[PDB]
Design a protein around this ligand. Structure first.
Ligand SMILES: O=c1[nH]c2cc(Cl)ccc2o1
Length: 167
């Protein structure tokens, strides 16, 4: 049994809700929240900008030190950093950004990072300002992630479309 409330069950391991990921993290304090990161961990906008704002910029300060030591992530890659006031840990995952011309096949590699964590609160990778089709992102999630994932969808309209169209 866990804390997550109000989710629709899509599969054995994937659950979805129309919710503010920031507000959901604040309520649940999950072990892992996933950030929709870029390779520079520059949390300007989208999910990343919202998560970082909710940490009062402490996520960005920590991320800048991580990059200064380790250099950029790979597209499809991840790192584990603090969850600050939102979660125990934040898994920063880089999905491909279609608005930069990145290979959408890297979306599966991105979701494979979730399998290193038994339970996660996450957004749909490469959705929103990363330019991918969220329906496709949900399909790759279901077909890749084997651990228990609780997906938060920002738009109510999009949430309803993802549920109605789910095979
Ligand atoms: O809380 C949130 N969720 C979000 C989802 C997208 Cl795509 C963008 C900004 C967001 O801020």
């Amino acid at each position: 049994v866990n804390s997550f409330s109000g989710y629709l069950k899509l599969t054995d391991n994937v659950y979805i809700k129309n919710a503010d990921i920031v507000e959901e993290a604040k309520k649940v304090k999950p072990t892992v929240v996933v950030n929709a990161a870029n390779v520079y961990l520059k949390h300007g906008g989208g999910v990343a900008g919202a998560l970082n704002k909710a940490t009062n910029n402490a996520m960005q300060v920590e991320s800048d030190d991580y990059i200064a030591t380790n250099g950029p992530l790979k597209v499809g890659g991840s790192c584990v950093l603090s969850g600050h006031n939102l979660a125990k840990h934040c898994l920063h995952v880089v999905g491909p950004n279609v608005n930069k011309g990145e290979d959408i096949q890297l979306l599966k590699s991105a979701y494979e990072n979730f399998n290193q964590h038994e339970v996660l609160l996450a957004p749909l990778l490469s959705a929103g300002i990363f330019g991918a089709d969220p329906i496709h992102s949900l399909r790759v999630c279901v077909d890749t992630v084997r651990t228990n994932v609780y997906l938060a969808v920002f738009d109510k309209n999009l949430y309803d479309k993802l549920v109605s169209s789910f095979l």
